[PDB]
Amino acid sequence: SGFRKMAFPSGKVEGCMVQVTCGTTTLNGLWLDDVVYCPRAVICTSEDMLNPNYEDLLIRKSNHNFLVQAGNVQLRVIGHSMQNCVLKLKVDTANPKTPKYKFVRIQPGQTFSVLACYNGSPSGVYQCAMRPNFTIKGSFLNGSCGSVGFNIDYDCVSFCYMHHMELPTGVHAGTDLEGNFYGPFVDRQTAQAAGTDTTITVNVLAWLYAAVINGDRWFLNRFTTTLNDFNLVAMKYNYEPLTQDHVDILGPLSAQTGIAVLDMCASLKELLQNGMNGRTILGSALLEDEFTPFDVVRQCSGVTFQ
């Protein structure tokens, strides 16, 4: 029993983190086989940052302008290229700790583990959701650029995020591992702002199922609702509209608890209209939307505690 924001074990990713320095700028890199992937911002100084012609800066660089440090060992860069907003630095040594891996791009509403890193040294791990506006509510300081986000399936690491920047609101933006940004953001220090965010409805429902699986039914009611009638309430409260696919994905949790999805939607409708009245759900006083249905199933018992 219990329900926690749980990250994946980070060791497979720890074995791949390196430090990349070009001039007086340093950040983190990801060393897989004989390639080190890192944000192209490593080739910029502070004055370059308003108007960087990343291209123009890269042609003026050689292989030996890139210092890659893996623990106590310097790796020799033998080739470099830019792919969108990341650099690929070919080194002369393949990483003996390279896990089975994939480069995956995730959807808003999905979750992943972040290994926060500084000077190529891992410092912390935490669980994140990709917000509908393509930002993440992370915890990152200067030097974190190049830390990665990931999921692990069996023993395959699916890398999905490389960290680049912090927006004025204090949320964070980055790219997939081919250097393509999530959302309408660019790697320069300019006035950028995220679009208006919404709450991930299917995730809130999944979390409500988690609460019932952990023996808690206080928010339940005897009412039901149509999909269209629920979505009319969701739009009023800045919740994402619910689809039949979301109802389908919630099926397994619905069968485990015996609560029809549209019945849980009615419970959520009541919670949105009435608040919580001083009560809590799984230790929170607001509706949590950073757990996916997969996250709930993975962590909760397969039996509901009736």
Partner: peptide
């Protein structure tokens, strides 16, 4: 206020 590229620049 302006976005920050969270490298460590000197």
């Amino acid at each position: 206020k302006v976005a920050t590229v969270q490298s460590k620049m000197s």
